[PDB]
Design a protein around this nucleic acid. Structure first.
Ligand SMILES: [Zn+2]
Lengths: 177, 76, 49, 141, 117
RNA sequence: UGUGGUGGCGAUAGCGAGAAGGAUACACCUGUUCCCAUGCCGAACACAGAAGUUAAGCUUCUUAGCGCCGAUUGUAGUGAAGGGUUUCCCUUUGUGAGAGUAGGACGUCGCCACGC
RNA sequence: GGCGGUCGCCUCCUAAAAGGUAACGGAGGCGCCCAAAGGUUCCCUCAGAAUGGUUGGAAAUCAUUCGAAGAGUGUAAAGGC
RNA sequence: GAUGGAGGUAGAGCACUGUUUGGACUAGUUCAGAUAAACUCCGAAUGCCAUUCAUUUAU
């Protein structure tokens, strides 16, 4: 779609030269994108995962999973298997459209332009964004929203050393500092 | 004035036929809890892990790889 | 809550089996396809009211 | 008195010492040792009495290693009570010591202070003893 | 990330198929290999540890299609060739695959041309 | 011979470090029309393929750092037969460890297919 | 002797490397539960730790890398997996 | 007497669970040293079960 051209036409020559890759298999990629919502409020009101899921599906053409307890802790009134949050996974074209709407439309709606921190790379080459609310997107609306909540993002790639992903990630967008 | 004092009946577990002994079909070879010993050629397992012959032959206790044991029965 | 029970055949009316159930878990009557020895056949047996 | 935190069993058997030490028969951390030549039980109070006597004599400190720990409990019944019902209540702690075991170690102090201190510790104890030094290996400083 | 190889994940299922299936000389073992461009087949007895017949996908002379149709030819070939060696009573080891796709094609062709399963 | 497959034998067969290789084969890789699939996702499993590449798996070769297999002689115990106080200790005769070591070891045996 | 406790059944130690073995010896459980928590066919692999991530904190839920078992097994403990 | 076997005791060991002493360290793992009846990576002497076996003997 939009970036396969961009890879095979701007970036793969760059990255293949910057680290002197003897093969093109060696060039990193983007494998997944996984979205998280930590609700933690089906504890009280059962009608909270519902809105979380409505918003996340307004984003992407995909009904999200439902993550449950996985154990029972009394600090949060948790039994086992109390459905807590929802998640989504994105392959192929769902990833490039979503990255494009992240870099070119949605993200800059956030003010105080701190972009993306750099203590955010796991030490192995995958990256995780951060979002506080939901209003940052053109798929969301004004009134329908009722809570200030936002979503976690993780972008996983095939890279050994962090800096390789640093470049392969800035080169496609994601306006770092 | 003690609160101990109770036990259960002994169960007579162990080996009921020897290595190198000839045996007729159906005879018990070993009573156990769980598989301490495993079943081999021409031997079955019961409902509570007892091992029995299926065929008449001689009994041979062997070694199952590195850390397990086997019983087999071999007809003449 | 657990109660012993009898399942009765539905064509020849012979009580062929004895079994269990929990009657706050299963409120209605059990129903199984069991071999009926009088007719030498598999038949719908049902629990005696 | 030394006491084990958190035992797993409240009572246990006693026997059967049958002397010969299984473990530390050489000096490990100090320069001088106190080795038992008979086999006996040694209690909390005997160890503390010996330790206090040994440390008081060494003005300017030095260092002292106690190498014997009471793991095993006692029990006992009371006067005026007939034989019969279950074990008594636990009263005490002990360690069994077999002949050969080194029990204390001292360093940082010349011979005579160390020898006098080990002499004063042994009169507090129910065993016969010797005094030993680190003798000869690949390296003994 | 580390994608695992598929061949080890199917060795791990093959070793559990084989706790039941095994082949003697009255009832040899019809095995199957399925690679990215072929499928193979051997007829194996295990007390002696040997092969009695075989047929391979695109090694010898099969072609006339390159859909699943390559498999049915191999099934028919091992059927004929094993009936040449006095063999009718084999047992089928799937490998670790499903009895579903182009392994089912080979198996079916085996059952039409001489081998009772 | 080389490679693919499928088997026996207690890892002496394993782990980690290092190199090399694409002849066929093995793989990664490319797609979702059709058989089938995701408690979301063609990721997997299923199928259609053959642009691209030896980077990763795979194969071969070097390495005794980690595991594994370890003798010999000395002890500890203990069958029989005897002696002191009998808590415990000792002497004859037979058996003999666990530790700790000298050494071994980077597999060995077999069937099928194709290529040289 | 009385008062106190105990009286059937299961698991461990005592128990002396087959089986068996006392004491008002040392420790615990049972008098049920499950219509699936039974049968069978396919498929799967755990507990933790470290790193990042908005609410969210040590610890709910996401991603990666180490991880032979340090988990689970309706219910006591042993033997098994 | 010879040959095969089942089994965890006397040792002694710290891989697993309890109990425990010194030292280095750091997050803000390590080096040594002990110990056990209900601990075990290990493991005897003897006893026990067998055998178309052998030599004496009489059950
Ligand atoms: Zn009827």
């Amino acid at each position: 779609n939009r970036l396969k051209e961009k890879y095979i036409k701007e970036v793969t020559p760059s990255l293949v030269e910057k680290f002197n890759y003897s093969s093109v298999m060696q060039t990193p990629k983007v494998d997944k994108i996984v979205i998280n919502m930590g609700v933690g409020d089906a504890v009280s009101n059962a009608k909270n995962l519902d809105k979380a899921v409505e918003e996340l599906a307004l984003i992407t053409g995909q009904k999200p999973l439902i993550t449950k307890a996985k154990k029972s802790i009394a600090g949060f009134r948790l039994r086992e298997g109390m459905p807590i949050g929802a998640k989504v996974t994105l392959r192929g074209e769902r990833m490039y459209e979503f990255l494009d709407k992240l870099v070119t439309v949605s993200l800059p709606r956030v003010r105080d332009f701190h972009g993306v921190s750099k203590k955010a790379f796991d030490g192995r080459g995958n990256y995780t964004l951060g979002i506080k609310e939901q209003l940052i997107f053109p798929e969301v609306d004004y009134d329908l929203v009722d809570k200030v909540r936002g979503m976690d993002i993780v972008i996983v790639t095939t890279a050994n050393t962090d800096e390789e992903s640093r470049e392969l990630l800035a080169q496609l967008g994601m306006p770092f500092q | 004035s003690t609160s101990n004092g109770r036990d259960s009946e002994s169960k007579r577990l162990g080996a009921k036929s020897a290595d190198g002994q000839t045996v007729t079909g159906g005879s018990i070879l070993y009573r156990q809890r769980g598989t301490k010993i495993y079943p081999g050629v021409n031997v079955g397992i019961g409902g509570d892990d007892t091992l029995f012959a299926k065929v008449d032959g001689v009994v041979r206790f062997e070694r199952k790889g590195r850390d397990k044991k086997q019983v087999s029965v071999y007809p003449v | 809550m657990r109660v012993n029970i009898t399942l009765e055949c539905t064509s020849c009316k012979e009580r062929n089996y004895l079994t269990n159930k929990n009657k706050r878990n299963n409120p209605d009557r059990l129903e199984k396809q069991k071999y009926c020895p009088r007719e030498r056949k598999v038949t719908l047996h049902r629990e005696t009211k | 008195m030394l006491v084990p935190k958190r035992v797993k069993h409240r009572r246990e058997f006693r026997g059967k010492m049958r002397g010969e030490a299984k473990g530390g028969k050489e000096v490990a951390f100090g320069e001088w040792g106190l080795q038992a030549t008979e086999s006996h039980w040694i209690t909390n109070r005997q160890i503390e009495a010996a330790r206090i006597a040994m440390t008081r004599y060494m003005k300017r400190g030095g260092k002292v290693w106690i190498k014997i720990f009471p793991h095993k409990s006692y029990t006992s019944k009371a006067i005026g009570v007939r034989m019969g019902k279950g074990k008594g209540a636990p009263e005490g702690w002990v360690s069994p010591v077999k002949r050969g075991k080194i029990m204390f170690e001292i360093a940082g102090v010349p011979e005579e202070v160390a020898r006098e201190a080990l002499r004063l510790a042994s009169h507090k104890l129910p065993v016969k003893t010797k005094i030993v030094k680190r003798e000869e290996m690949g390296g003994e400083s | 990330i580390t994608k695992p190889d598929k061949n080890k994940t199917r060795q791990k299922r093959h070793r559990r198929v084989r706790n039941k299936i095994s082949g003697t000389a009255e009832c040899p073992r019809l095995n199957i290999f399925r690679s990215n461009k072929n499928i193979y087949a051997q007829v194996i007895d295990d007390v002696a540890g040997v092969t009695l017949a075989s047929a391979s996908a695109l090694d010898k002379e099969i072609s006339g299609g390159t859909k699943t149709e390559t498999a049915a030819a191999v099934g028919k070939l091992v059927a004929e060739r094993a009936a040449e060696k006095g063999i009718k009573k084999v047992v089928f080891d799937r490998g670790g695959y499903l009895y579903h796709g182009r392994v089912q094609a080979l198996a079916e062709a085996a059952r039409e041309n001489g081998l009772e399963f």
